[PDB]
Amino acid sequence: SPGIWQLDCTHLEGKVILVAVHVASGYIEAEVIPAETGQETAYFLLKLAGRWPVKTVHTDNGSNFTSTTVKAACDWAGIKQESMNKELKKIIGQVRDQAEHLKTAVQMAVFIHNHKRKGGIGGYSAGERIVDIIATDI
């Protein structure tokens, strides 16, 4: 399960957020982009794979995955194509106040989501789960 990611889209304030969730830990990355395009997705995946060892992404059916540029990026990076963010809507809502731009609220919420300890003393954050899973794997 170490290299499996889920990628999905969300539309807010007539704008687009790509969210990737590392499935075994619930760790996320997100970015706001103007539109859900092949180019934008492919750049996103390339960033992702250069940072974590991505093996497989699960995506929705959308055209932005079928593009020639996304397939070239996947081939180049060795990625094979095949709810956790409902919390991210919520966190985006709780911090919307604290910033002018959406892209800033998005990133603040990613920070909050990844650093938040689940459970009591002895708990782990998503950020800690992902690094532990990967370290263990090696």
Add this chain to the structure above:
Amino acid sequence: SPGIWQLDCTHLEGKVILVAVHVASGYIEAEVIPAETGQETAYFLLKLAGRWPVKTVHTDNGSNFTSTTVKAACDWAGIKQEDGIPSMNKELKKIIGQVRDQAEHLKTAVQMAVFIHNHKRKGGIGGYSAGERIVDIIATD
């Protein structure tokens, strides 16, 4: 020393590459930006700090770091900003030169070069890559 990151910039084809180096591992993260503004740096650091446990940052003390926007982002994320504290730039431009022909746009070749830097075995076949060192270094349990 595990939460220390150095920030740096490099220029190419007349655009700004913002680079974050994890000091103890060599792991790099990088984005191409329109210009070295307060806002673009703050946005960069905030994305960084949401992805890794960023305790400290060293800067070249460029003017984008003296901006209130950056200092306010560091604050929010609990990062200690350390301006003026002393290449990767050369090694990265050379890797960029090797993949440059495979990408329409610079930004894309930047992420390809980051990927290659992070996956490269350092030393012999018995060794480990930057991507491997950082997780090993950062893993708490």
